[PDB]
Amino acid sequence: PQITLWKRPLVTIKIGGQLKEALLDTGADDTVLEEMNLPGRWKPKMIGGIGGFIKVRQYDQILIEICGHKAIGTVLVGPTPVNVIGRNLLTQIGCTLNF
């Protein structure tokens, strides 16, 4: 689809078999979701945002469907203010900026 930006580009995603809402975030290198339960192994990691750094749980090679488009990649889980889909997954679904 073509998504204008007068509203937040929020989309429904499916991860771990559960539906959620997430923000398409071209300013994020990585995908960071709020606290949740995900199966499998994970490693501690740090990520920095506008306000500093936080601790997150890094889940690698995770299946995630974004607005009907499938991706398999890294998902960070931690105290983010909102679920953000970052460039690591936006590239998988073929997302580009256009103007």
Added chain:
Amino acid sequence: PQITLWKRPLVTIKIGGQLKEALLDTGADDTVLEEMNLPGRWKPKMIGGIGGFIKVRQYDQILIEICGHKAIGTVLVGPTPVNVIGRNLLTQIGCTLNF
């Protein structure tokens, strides 16, 4: 143009007679730029993201040129680690997400 997201979507902007690099950021409601001593009246504000909040100065009706596309709107200035062009200005240059 069409910007792929393999790398950060950085572009040259002109603001307050200065050239700078900034991210086209669909995840930012508004625009936040590095400390710069702009003229005019301003209003203190707090903006938050990953890692917490930072203090910024809100300037209204600021002219910005983004890849030769002129825009005018609110610009927040402060100790942000990165310059982000937010949706308030992206809509003005006709920017969309596409996949």
